[PDB]
Amino acid sequence: PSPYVGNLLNKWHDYIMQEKVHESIEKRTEIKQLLSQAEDNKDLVDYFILLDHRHSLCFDQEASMGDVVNMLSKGSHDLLINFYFELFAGDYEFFKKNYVKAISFYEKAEQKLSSIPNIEETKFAEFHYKIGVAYYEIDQHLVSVNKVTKARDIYKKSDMWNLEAIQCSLVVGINLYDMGRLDDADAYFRDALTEALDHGYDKPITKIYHNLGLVHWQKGSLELALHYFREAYSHEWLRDSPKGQQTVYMLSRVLYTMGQNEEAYHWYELGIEMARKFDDHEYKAKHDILYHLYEQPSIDEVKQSLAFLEERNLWPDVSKIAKGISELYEKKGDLVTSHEFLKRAFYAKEQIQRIT
Amino acid sequence: PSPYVGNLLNKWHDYIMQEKVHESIEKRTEIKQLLSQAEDNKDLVDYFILLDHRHSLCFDQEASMGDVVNMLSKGSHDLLINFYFELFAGDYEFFKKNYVKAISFYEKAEQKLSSIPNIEETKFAEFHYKIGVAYYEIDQHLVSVNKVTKARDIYKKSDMWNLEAIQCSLVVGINLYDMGRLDDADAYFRDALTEALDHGYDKPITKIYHNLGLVHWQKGSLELALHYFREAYSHEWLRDSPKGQQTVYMLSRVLYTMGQNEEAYHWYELGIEMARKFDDHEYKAKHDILYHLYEQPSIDEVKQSLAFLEERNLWPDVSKIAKGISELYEKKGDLVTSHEFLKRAFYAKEQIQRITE
Amino acid sequence: PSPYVGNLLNKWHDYIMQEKVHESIEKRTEIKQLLSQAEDNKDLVDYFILLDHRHSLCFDQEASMGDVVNMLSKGSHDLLINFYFELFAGDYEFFKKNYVKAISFYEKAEQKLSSIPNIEETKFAEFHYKIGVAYYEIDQHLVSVNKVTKARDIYKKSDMWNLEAIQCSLVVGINLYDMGRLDDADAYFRDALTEALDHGYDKPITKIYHNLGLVHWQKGSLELALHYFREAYSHEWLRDSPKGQQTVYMLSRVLYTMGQNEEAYHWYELGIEMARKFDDHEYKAKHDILYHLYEQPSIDEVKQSLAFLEERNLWPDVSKIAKGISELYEKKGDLVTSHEFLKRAFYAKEQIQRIT
Amino acid sequence: PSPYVGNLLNKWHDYIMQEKVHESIEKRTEIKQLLSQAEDNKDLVDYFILLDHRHSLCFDQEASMGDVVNMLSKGSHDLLINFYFELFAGDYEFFKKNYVKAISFYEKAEQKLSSIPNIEETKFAEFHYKIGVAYYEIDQHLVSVNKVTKARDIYKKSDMWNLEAIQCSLVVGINLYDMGRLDDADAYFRDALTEALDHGYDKPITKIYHNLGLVHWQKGSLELALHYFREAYSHEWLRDSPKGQQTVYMLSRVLYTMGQNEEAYHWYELGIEMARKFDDHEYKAKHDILYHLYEQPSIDEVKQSLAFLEERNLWPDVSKIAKGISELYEKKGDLVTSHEFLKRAFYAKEQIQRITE
């Protein structure tokens, strides 16, 4: 249910406000088509109606059907419309990677939740989660754990929202890992895994196994980390989704670190070939560094690809890759360029606090 | 036909509740037709929309192939619909003269008014006024003054809604007059008059002058009472309102109570003729009593017309009319039949406390 | 629990507001004494405390115990104090016979009932009744029935307030009688009577029987009316209460109307003797008219006593007594003075609408 | 000793809940004694009264022989007491450095703030500020800026509470500096300075100048950084505050980073001597690293003092100090030990994300 239609409905709201018949008929016709699918978002349809009705009051031929200066129901329509405008603007800003603006809009919409009459317990969890995830994108991990736990506690009660609870504990686990509290993250991931198995869910499982792989990778038990990355690739057909690119990369990277090189190059091959398929320039850079480090060394070529990743922000990945390089160039006895990369790995850490 | 459509919209709400497509499309079409008359009511149009949408969701389902399983907006639409249903049921009961039922419905709708957003101060004054006038209809004057003052105080603050404030002080004054507190009624009436003159208004003026005329009539200064009734007739072209009958009648009755029988008959003539134009049997009865008292006396004929007014539950005017007769027939030396009418004027007073709906 | 202490507490509130230590210590000492009884009014004690505490904040030696400019709790203390001030002012104005002012204060206090946190269902019935009874004093019978029915419906629910429900239906019945709907008033009175008998209550019974007597008196069945007035005198020792004066009067008046005269004079005697006992000048006037009508006629003497009652307002009683006289002076053939009294009975009716 | 009394009052509330006369009279006397210090806290006194009354009703019963069976005022007193209990529990947890628990309690008390009458806009800003600073304590800078801006916007409206607004912009700036957004921190700091100068205020000025000094220090323009640290020392008599230690340290460190070793040692001297006056082992460690770096080098001695700072969970300053060392030891040609410290400065960075309570 793409968050474009939300922005479309928001634009339409702006067009009714500027009293512009012709582009208002345009926006409502694009929108009217898109939501004709079988079952796509209660909140969209409601916002459509609430805009269509106020569209009429400004554009349809009232001259025989009264004078709607400002009726009693405007107060309550205003409240819903302002709320829907802010919920969907939040969703769209989150879509554009503009997380600070997204939180701003969500928090305004969260406020209006009290004045709406029959608000359900779950519309509060929705905002708890959306805010909590947006905070996770900007490395505010403690508040993220705080808000999505609040959502999880609601989703635990009712037994219809069991897929959401799994996603919530998945998000707490990721926060706990990004911090470094690895055994707590492990626990959350394992609790999501068994809850996902008891039910028929398959969607989250893949992410769960990949995170478990990351936990034990950072834990240093690479044998067990490798196991989980394999299981992530096994479960769900990811080879032609864009989102399964990361598992192929991790598989290659661990096998190169354990000195497995033979298999590691085969996952490199598959990952280069996927970087073709989706034209993902970043995963091409990341697999480039693997190749020009373990296959055909070239310190200058690694800097080239590293430079590209630094131009893309992506500073967690830069920090950890550059640290890896410096650690490696130390067992190879070269202090001079190991220091060069540690300086780059350190600068990357400082780039994570800024979050511009 | 304002609160008829309200009852129509209420019935339509009742048909959606019973999940009945066929009579819902019927009433929604008469109303859709009926609401095309240019006639200022925001709340009717609003209630139509709020019902049209709930009509669609139960019978049409939008023609877009949505889901519409109790959306976020259902909660608040429910609340508005429940409110409109009771406001218009109140208006309709007020229409059928069932004032106790009307207050009951208004007070229920007044409650739900608190739990609604962006409400103007005046939507509360409206219920203060409606309840206050319904109480006036059942001779509960002290509470009516209390409630319509509450409305007046809000309408005074805005200073944009002062045409309503004038009507409020008009209603307080009328209550005070029906009680007998004549100088207090005078004060309210004169204060509404100067407020109506300071701003650009002619609509209320005529009623204002007619009440001032009534006050000083009951005060006994008939010269000044006659003055005000003249001004009421002058200030609007009343020869074609149905409601301007009351000024013509008082003019005749005042001039007959004074010794100006010649002019008094001229207004009698006009008032009989107005009783023709409209199907007003009351003012024919009241003008009948005038004629069979001052022109060609006939105690039996007066009894007939008075009897008709008593059959109409018009117990205030009967009380006052019968008292007048008794007072007159005493300076005419006839105690016997003066006592007959004082007994009837007294019985009428007891009929004013006793009122049933 | 006299409504003087309420006015006392209100005066004290006024003295703290004018920052007047010395008369504040005076008022709180009179009050502190009076409420030392075993069990006298929750609301009084609460208002005392709430004033004593704000008394301290203006008068006690804070100089070492902080600077109470305006703390957080002032908002909520203000609300309770303003409420108690208006409840007890209402009670006191009702005490002074100033019913319009009393309703004004009650209705302001009724409004504040929503903002207080744990308000019980019965504090609303209390105001419904108090307002409803105040309206009854000023002949606004339809609204009185409306409000005290609202109170009665609350008192019906819980089974601890069964004495109040009896009083409520007693008040509806009186309204219905003052209007003239005699069979409905009869029904309410009979329903209060059986409810009072099922329980051990004796306080209302006497008033119930006297009202039932009035109903059937106005109904014209004087035999049965006389029965109830007797039963009113029988139940409860009223001969030395001021409030039992009215039953002795009714007993005498009915027996004089039925031509019983022998017994009627004996109740006249007792009623004159009670008018001595309490110096009730009105019941002396009312019994005077009985005597100078049925015992030693004197049209001039009746006018004298009637004049006194008209100087006391009491216009219901004047209207009905004067009407009685005129009716009687008609079977005696004297139209001249019967008309004199009907004029006076009619004027009295007009005095009931004014209520100045 | 402000939030100690809060915990004392909370314990007293706990003793009334367990219906325990003997320890209730004890704590209520220490608090009654302790609150005689002239020290601005409305809310403490208020909480005492609200507890003293509930103490009486459970143990004294007023000494007037009342009834006091849950009166009308009990409902609202309950609500205030529950609120004060959680506000002061929050303050006490903040006192013990347990910031996550403190936010938990503040957020609970923030909820009950909505259901209370006559509330000022600022009592909401207070919780915005307290929560915002607690989040700053656990390096959650983006939410801290978000919450303390919310406080600032209320404190700006009043225009009576602008000394608080200055403190709010001080806190936003510090967050922005801890992040690295130096020009945005600069802007907030300069805007607080002009607001502090336009009105009559000296209290914040010193901290304002010290942060501006820090910004441009991290910006690398040491000449102007040195200027601001001088002004911080000048603007208040800091020779007797414990908190003015930080300006003396920066002055020395800046002058040592520049080539002004002579003056730098004079501020080192003063800073060692201040580390004596107070039991501040941190600033002795930090000044120790300065001395064993620029005066009498000893890489092993620096490791000792740095180690002490790492044992204190002071991971920001260790990150910056270790980075400084590594940078310096490279122009000194020694890559080997420069790498040793960059590894430690990097480890310190990872220690800043990981924080446990």
Numbering used by the authors:
A (entry chain B), C (entry chain B): 9 to 364
B (entry chain A), D (entry chain A): 9 to 365
Authors' own words:
A recently identified B. subtilis RRNPP member, RappLS20, is encoded by the Gram-positive B. subtilis conjugative plasmid pLS20. It lacks the conserved residues essential for phosphatase activity and has been shown to regulate the conjugation process. RappLS20 activates conjugation by acting as an antirepressor of RcopLS20 (22), which induces the formation of a DNA loop by binding to two closely located recognition sequences near the Pc, thereby inhibiting expression of the conjugation genes and plasmid transfer. The presence of the Phr*pLS20 peptide antagonizes the antirepressive action of RappLS20, reverting the system to its default state.
The apo structure shows that RappLS20 is all α-helical, consisting of 17 antiparallel helices that are connected by short loops. The C-terminal region consists of 14 helices forming 7 bi-helical TPR motifs, making up the typical solenoid structure associated with TPR folds. The inner surface of the solenoid is lined by the even-numbered helices from H4 to H16, which form the pocket to which the peptide binds. The TPR topology is lost at the N-terminal end of helix H4, as helix H3 is located towards the inner lining and helix H2 towards the outer lining of the solenoid, an inversion with respect to helices H4 and H5. The loop between helices H3 and H4, indicated in red in Figure 1B, therefore marks the boundary between the NTD and the C-terminal TPR domain. Helices 1–3 form an antiparallel three-helix bundle, where helices H1 and H3 interact with the N-terminal region of helix H4. The three helices of the NTD are approximately parallel and therefore do not form a HTH topology. RappLS20 forms dimers in the packing of the crystal structure in a similar fashion to the B. subtilis phosphatase RapH. The interaction involves the protein surface of helices H5–H7 and H16–H17, including the C-terminal residues. The buoyant mass obtained was 22 930 ± 110 Da, corresponding to a molar mass of 89 970 ± 440 Da, using a partial specific volume of 0.7363, confirming that RappLS20 (theoretical Mw of 44.4 kDa) behaves predominantly as a dimer in solution. In the absence of Phr*pLS20, the NTDs are positioned such that they allow the interaction with RcopLS20.
